[PDB]
Design a protein around this ligand. Structure first.
Ligand SMILES: *[C@@H]1O[C@H](CO)[C@@H](O)[C@H](O)[C@H]1NC(C)=O
Ligand SMILES: [Ca+2]
Ligand SMILES: [Ca+2]
Ligand SMILES: [Cl-]
Ligand SMILES: [Cl-]
Length: 530
């Protein structure tokens, strides 16, 4: 809808097409954040012969708007934005970076060395240091998380740069103040140009609006409450669709969510219950930029208002990135130096999987692969090493010894012990003719319910050859988490023993009922490495 205007039409006061100055801006591919600096100058509006290009904007009541000479393919889209919440299930930080980087339409890698064999294990390069990836990494370090993404997109405009755009004088000067090649000493001079003008520059754009909400769900806390990561995730998507008006309070999907809300005795909605969210809002006024899917003021009316603001205040939805060196001429030797510099900057900032690092607290590396983490109790715990129910613990009863022990008939004691817990029974060997017997038994009760139990029963028996053995005494104890020393007083003497009841990973408290986060062993991630 753009046309070549006459010298008179060009003299007229007209605003530029919305968000046009976004094209040509530099961007750091590792963070997916605009550099603030412009290696390309798109400011020129009037052609050498004093004529220009003007566009009729159908999204702004056919307003006559100015188009810079460096901009081509200006195309406005529909004002109608389909109320559709795009849901995604992400399982790692690598996936979050991938979902963030999915907004780059082209191959940003072209002409760059973005391939080390040891530093390429499940490596995130684009969006590795993006705000959303850093959010997913911080969560990953704290506890075992599963991520749910809910997205709404409206495309308002699309435009691109010219094949040979005019370079900025500030950029041309910065290129001169650079050394001839990328040795190991010039590393700082080049990294200053990269940190200022970005690794790439935006060559094409799709402007409009985007609401992107990443919800972090503690995978093991969910399993204890009888919910799955996919169950809660699907419920959030439905709640987001209600807030934007995609579906009303009367639908098959929303009925299932209201059923699960009552079934699991929830006071408020899934979004009011699971508040560990990262929110990205692009487009609309900065004065009214907030969560429209899971916000407290999030109404279908509030979504329409935002949608209406998009034509005049558009944000960067998706784009095409080209490396900085592509701006320099092929004859110039500083191009190959910058190409190598960008390659080095991007690569040093990569985030990969170091199989040398220890597994998440409560896991261990298998003998088969150094990159494979195994659960401690495969029987009771499901996948992702989450305990199936509250109260599960590893009970080991040992250090069995009795002092000055005898019964109602004789001082000649032929003692042995019967130990009971959770339907399981263990028996020691007989210590013939001894008032102070000591047993070497280490009773592994494996995985038991510390809450249900019932009691940890220790029966002291006296072995009688032909006749029925006589019970010297019996005692009960309600086991608690940790190492405990027990002393049971009998009619003659006492029986002593100890037990360590270790809560399964993700469980804490006296009877292993409470939920506990399982963090990664080491220091928190905040810098470039694997
Ligand atoms: C710096 O670059 C120059 C290019 O002429 C090279 O001669 C020199 O060895 C480099 N310095 C290093 C690699 O420390
Ligand atoms: Ca006996
Ligand atoms: Ca007997
Ligand atoms: Cl005791
Ligand atoms: Cl013990």
């Amino acid at each position: 809808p753009c046309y070549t205007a006459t010298r008179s039409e060009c003299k007229q006061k007209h605003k530029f097409v919305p968000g046009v100055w976004m094209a040509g801006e530099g961007m750091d591919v590792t963070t997916l954040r605009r550099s603030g600096s412009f290696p390309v100058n798109t400011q020129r509006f009037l052609r050498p012969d004093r004529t220009c290009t003007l566009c009729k904007n159908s999204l702004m009541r056919d307003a006559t708007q100015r188009l810079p000479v460096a901009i081509t393919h200006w195309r406005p889209h529909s004002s109608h934005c389909q109320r559709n919440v795009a849901a995604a299930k992400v399982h790692s930080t690598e996936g979050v970076a991938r979902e963030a980087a999915a907004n780059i339409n082209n191959d940003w890698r072209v002409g760059l060395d973005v391939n080390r064999p040891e530093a390429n294990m499940r490596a995130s390069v684009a969006g590795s240091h993006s705000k959303v990836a850093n959010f997913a990494a911080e969560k990953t370090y704290q506890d075992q998380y599963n991520f749910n993404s809910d997205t709404v997109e409206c495309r308002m405009y699309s435009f691109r740069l010219v094949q040979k755009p005019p370079l900025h004088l500030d950029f041309k000067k910065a290129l001169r103040a650079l050394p001839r090649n990328f040795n190991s000493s010039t590393e700082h001079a080049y990294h200053e140009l990269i940190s200022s003008y970005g690794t790439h520059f935006i060559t094409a754009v799709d402007l409009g609006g985007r609401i992107s909400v990443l919800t972090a769900l503690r995978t093991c806390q969910l399993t204890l409450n009888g919910l799955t990561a996919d169950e809660v995730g699907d419920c959030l998507n439905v709640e987001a669709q209600v807030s934007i008006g995609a579906q009303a309070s009367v639908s098959s999907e929303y009925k299932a969510c209201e059923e699960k809300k009552k079934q699991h005795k929830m006071a408020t909605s899934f979004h009011q219950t699971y508040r560990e969210r990262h929110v990205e809002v692009l487009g609309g006024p900065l004065d009214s930029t907030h969560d429209l899917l899971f916000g407290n003021q999030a109404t279908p009316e509030q979504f329409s208002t935002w949608t209406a603001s998009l034509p005049s205040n558009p944000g960067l939805v998706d784009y095409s990135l080209e490396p900085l060196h592509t701006l320099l001429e092929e004859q110039n030797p500083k191009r190959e130096a910058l190409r190598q510099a960008i390659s080095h900057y991007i690569m040093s900032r990569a985030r990969w999987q170091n199989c040398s690092r220890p597994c998440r607290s409560g896991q261990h590396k298998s003998s088969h692969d150094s990159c494979q983490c195994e659960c401690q109790d495969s029987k009771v715990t499901n996948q992702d090493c989450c305990p199936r129910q509250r109260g599960l613990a590893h009970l080991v009863v040992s250090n069995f010894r009795a002092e000055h022990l005898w019964g109602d008939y004789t001082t000649a004691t032929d003692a042995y012990l019967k130990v009971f817990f959770g339907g399981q029974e263990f028996r020691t060997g007989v210590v013939w003719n001894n008032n102070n017997p000591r047993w070497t038994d280490k009773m592994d009760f494996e995985n038991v319910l510390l809450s249900t139990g019932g009691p940890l029963r220790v029966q002291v028996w006296d072995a009688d050859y032909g006749w029925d053995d006589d019970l010297l005494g019996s005692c009960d104890r309600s086991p608690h988490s940790g190492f405990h020393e027990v002393t049971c007083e009998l009619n003659h003497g006492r029986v002593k023993f100890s037990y360590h009841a270790k809560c399964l990973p993700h469980l804490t408290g006296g009877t292993c009922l409470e939920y506990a986060p399982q963090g990664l062993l080491g220091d928190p991630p905040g810098n470039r490495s694997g």
